[PDB]
Amino acid sequence: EGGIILARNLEHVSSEIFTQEFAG
Amino acid sequence: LTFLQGGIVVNNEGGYATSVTKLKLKAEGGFRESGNDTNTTGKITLSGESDSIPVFTLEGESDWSEIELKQAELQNVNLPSRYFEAHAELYNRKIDELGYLGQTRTDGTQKTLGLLNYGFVASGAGDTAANLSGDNLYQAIADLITDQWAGVFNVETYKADRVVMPDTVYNICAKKILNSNGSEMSVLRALMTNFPTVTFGLTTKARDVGGTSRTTAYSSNRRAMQMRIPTPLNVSSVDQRGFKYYVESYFGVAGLDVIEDTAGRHLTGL
Amino acid sequence: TQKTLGLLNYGFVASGAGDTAANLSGDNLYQAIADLITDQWAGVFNVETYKADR
Amino acid sequence: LTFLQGGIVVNNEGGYATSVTKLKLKAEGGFRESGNDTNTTGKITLSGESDSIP
Amino acid sequence: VVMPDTVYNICAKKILNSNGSEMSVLRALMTNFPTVTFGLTTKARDVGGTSRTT
Amino acid sequence: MAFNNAVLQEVSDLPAGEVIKASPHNVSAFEVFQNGLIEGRFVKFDAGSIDILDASATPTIAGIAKRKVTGEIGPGVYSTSGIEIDQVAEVINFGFATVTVQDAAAPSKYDPVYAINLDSAEAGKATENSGATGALAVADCVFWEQKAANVWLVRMNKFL
Amino acid sequence: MAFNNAVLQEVSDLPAGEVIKASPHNVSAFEVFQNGLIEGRFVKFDAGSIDILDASATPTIAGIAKRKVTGEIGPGVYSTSGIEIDQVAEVINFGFATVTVQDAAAPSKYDPVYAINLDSAEAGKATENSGATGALAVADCVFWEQKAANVWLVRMNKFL
Question: How far apart are CA F77 and CA F75, in angstroms?
Fold first, then answer.
């Protein structure tokens, strides 16, 4: 039934973290 | 094939995951004036946001009989080598098409947006570039560039450092003289002088996007937009069944990960 | 009848200029010739191998 | 007489052959979007075409 | 001089007069004010409810 | 809650929406489809999209929604726009494939398959009984053998 | 014409008479045929020979004439008695195959395939238009997807 892979493992949360940027 | 020369960095990150998610951490708060021995009310904390992009997968197929291979060796056409090279070439062309216009379904509707047709802010120019004066063509392209810059609050990271326009429009700009009264110098030669950081590129892909030409400025920075190709072109080993050789080749590719919304701008109609 | 064609007779795509070169402004003349060259360039999807160099 | 200064290269390898034939090999087809386990419907083949000048 | 980034960008892109040259407003200023360095800031966008150069 | 059915009496056979690849077989990918497309059911083709059977005139049965082994854990469902987004609808149109059957149905080998054509949960379920409500004669398809509980491996003689 | 389509802004898509091997396919060689058999076209079996469709009433349609990829450069035509001689008329009769479509035809997926049963160069060309002149239904054969200019991948469901 359905599948074998848990949903959250079908998503790769990127290791690169993007900091918020503000005016110069 | 100008996308990979278009400055966008390609990131093969999430191998076979069906989605790629990026996280942003923003600092909030600020310092407060305090006395010599006072307890502050200035607290620095941080929050975050998440952005996800689905990953789809394309797969092509080629095949050849042994009679085919031997007969074509008469012509010095190496069907294994030529088929593998066709796979690679079509993969490069597909990556270019995906980066610029994304993926369109076979029936006709479109599923993923690319760089050209992304949901950036799009302003329509006065008239077509051919009908348009050299000064007004310069004004249109420069108004696009600086409108994007104002949108990003002129942050060096998100500031548009590249512009891609249809080869028709790029040639027109390169050959339209800005004003005859000054010199023969062209509109493109004026833009390349007043915007020494923006490199102007071109693509045939822009000739017609959504029923009209589409120029667009964007920033080729990792933190502004990336080209997600999580699975580069994987060509299977040749499966021989009798004398019939068979090859599949799949690559799993996400679209253009436009990390920041107002990191590009469109001139619709030129 | 014509047996074979040449540079000028060939079935290339033709466009009628707005007016003759004798009375078009120097700006208009430059734009006409550049439009010829760049529309040839556009017809070949701007491939340096096939771009009109003459 | 301007054509021989028209920049077009002159090829004289035909000899006395009644024609010169030219062949261009394309590649054709394209990838189709597939699922986890499907039979591909996008084929990639190799094609050719020729043109002869008598 | 510090002007809002919008004004600085318009200065650095608006050509002074196309009849003279492609030289922009900012380039003309840099030529005629060899001692003035023209900077930019974002906080000048709305100080006092109205954009302000200094 | 806890794992369902701690201990099962017998090893369950093939789940619905599964295709045996020993025999000739074809599962064909359709990119556009309907959200909530139940796997292991007959699926129709309408307006150029693979969608769930529902009461219609004469739906174009395009085959059996293939169950993805490496899909999201959960109900057999084809999803769009989620963490469990399924890019294409994998549909089995040739060969032997497992389809759920109506719990009332008691089919047998070489019986003509009938799909269910209703706007309900029973949409796309197979059956032998032709007098069942919304029984649509699937062209050239026969029940082959009972695989699992309320799941039968049927044989599509030609493509669907 | 000299090298039509000098530059293309996209790689040309699959030509006709080309069968995809990813699925259950069959191309079966017929040792006798008619001179002037167009590759990528519906052929018929008559009097113990494969031949181009003509004014006949109820031809037994074999299948798509396979395009000999390492055949002759030129028209996709089977030919006896030449340096361009093809010994056997290999004919695609099962699965997904590309056939030239009538220049005026606008088909879509799962559309029944009608072949032009005429005496012309338009013989054997596939069309979705039943009302078209000189066309007969190629039973158990549907359109799948527009590959190239006037070329479509169709599906021969049974051995055609």
Answer: 6
Interchain proximity G11–D30, CB inside 8 Å: yes
For residue B114, the 8-state DSSP code is -
The residues pairing with B217 across neighbouring beta strands, listed in sequence order, are B163, B265
DSSP secondary structure letter of residue F67: P
Question: Position of tokens 């054709």?
Answer: D28
Residues D40, G64: Cα–Cα separation, whole Å: 20
Residue type, B269: G
- To the nearest 10 degrees (0 to 180), the angle between helices B167-175 and C26-43 is 150
Q: Cα F49–G148–B104 angle (5° rounding)? A: 45
Tokens matching residue G20 = 């995809």
Residues in B closer than 8 angstroms to G145, CB to CB, are 106
Q: Which two tokens stand for residue C15?
A: 């466009």
Answer for the pair G17, G82: CB distance below 8 angstroms, yes or no: no
Which experimental approach was used here? cryo-EM
What does the block give as tokens for B139?
């004004």
Smallest Cα distance from A10 to chain F, Å:
7
Residue matched to tokens 């089919």: F107
F116 close to F102: Cβ distance less than 8 angstroms: yes
Report residue F130 as tokens.
């032709």
Q: Could you tell me which chain D residue has the CA closest to the CA of F27?
A: D38
- Residues B252 and F59: their CA atoms lie apart, in Å, by 33
DSSP single-letter state for residue E22: E
B134/B180 Cα distance (integer angstroms): 9
Please, which chains are in contact with F (at least 3 CB pairs closer than 8 A)? Answer: A, B, D, G
Specify the 3-state DSSP secondary structure of C29.
Answer: helix
Per-residue b or e along B51-88, where b marks 16 or more CB atoms closer than 10 Å to that residue's CB: bebbbbbbbbbbbbbeebbebbeeeebebeebbbebbe
| CB neighbours of residue B132 within 10 Å | 21
Resolution of the structure in the document, Å: 3.2
Q: Where are the alpha helices (DSSP H) in chain B?
A: 66-72, 79-101, 134-151, 167-175, 187-194
Q: What is the gyration radius of the CA atoms in chain G, in angstroms?
A: 15
Q: Which value, to the nearest 10 degrees, does the dihedral of the CA atoms of residues B88, B94, B96, B97 take?
A: 160
Q: After which residues is the backbone of chain G broken at C–N > 2.5 Å?
A: none
Helices B187-194 and B167-175: angle between axes, nearest 10 degrees: 90
Cβ-based burial of B194 (10 A; exposed 0-12, middle 13-18, buried ≥19):
buried
Size of chain G in residues: 160
Residue at token pair 């059977």: F53
With residue D14 as reference, give the H or E element that holds it.
none
- Cα–Cα distance between G157 and F94 in angstroms, integer? 9
- The two tokens of residue F104 are 């009332």
Residues belonging to chain G with any Cβ–Cβ distance to chain F shorter than 8 Å: 23-24, 95, 108-110, 140, 155, 157-158
**What b/e string do you get for A1-24 counting C-beta neighbours within 10 Å, with b at 16 or more?**
ebbebebeebbbbbeeebeebeee
Q: List the chains bordering chain A where 3 or more Cβ pairs fall under 8 Å.
A: B, E, F
Give the number of other CB atoms < 10 A from CB of residue C48: 8
In three-state secondary structure terms, F103 is: coil
User: On the CB side of F144, how many CA atoms lie within 13 Å of its CA?
Assistant: 17
Instruction: Give the separation between CA E33 and CA C3, rounded to whole angstroms.
Output: 70
DSSP strand pairing (G60-65 vs G42-46): antiparallel
